[PDB]
Amino acid sequence: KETAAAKFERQHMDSSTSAASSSNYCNQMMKSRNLTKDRCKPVNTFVHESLADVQAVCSQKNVACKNGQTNCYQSYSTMSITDCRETGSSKYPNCAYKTTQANKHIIVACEGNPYVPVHFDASV
């Protein structure tokens, strides 16, 4: 059954692009990563870095997660991220997203051994 660590990679990693390059990125990626299968996931972030650099955040700065959990970590560095937010025209199964490209610090929740990212908490 898909592990939380593999789910994190499927929902949030895009190491094969340095940034989104068209306003269609989100529409394409959300669908291809199967995030719109049962319903339109309202918001999702993609990280354009190597997985190794993202797993390493689990050893960077410890911060409370937005929900008060103490297993969150904030990247020491800014990262290339694409934010995808549902549009007013989004209608299941035709989920429609606005693509935003930015460079920010990321916040993830880590668990297990090896200790790796399992949830994308926020970009700051």
From Swiss-Prot:
Subcellular location field: Secreted
Example GO BP: defense response to Gram-positive bacterium
GO molecular function: lyase activity; nucleic acid binding; ribonuclease A activity; RNA nuclease activity
Active site residues per record: H12 (proton acceptor), H119 (proton donor)
EC class: lyase
Superkingdom in the source lineage: Eukaryota
Chief location bin: secreted
Keywords: Disulfide bond, Endonuclease, Glycation, Glycoprotein, Hydrolase, Lyase, Nuclease, Secreted, Signal
Tissue specificity of this protein: Pancreas.
Residues annotated to bind substrate: K7, R10, K41, P42, V43, N44, T45, K66, R85
An example Gene Ontology CC term for this record: extracellular region
Covalent S-S links between cysteines: C26-C84, C40-C95, C58-C110, C65-C72
EC number: 4.6.1.18
Protein role: Endonuclease that catalyzes the cleavage of RNA on the 3' side of pyrimidine nucleotides. Acts on single-stranded and double-stranded RNA.
Record text on subunit structure and interactions: Interacts with and forms tight 1:1 complexes with RNH1. Dimerization of two such complexes may occur. Interaction with RNH1 inhibits this protein. Monomer.
Protein name according to UniProt: Ribonuclease pancreatic
Source organism of the structure: Bos taurus
Gene encoding the protein: RNASE1
Entire protein: shown range: 27 to 150 of 150
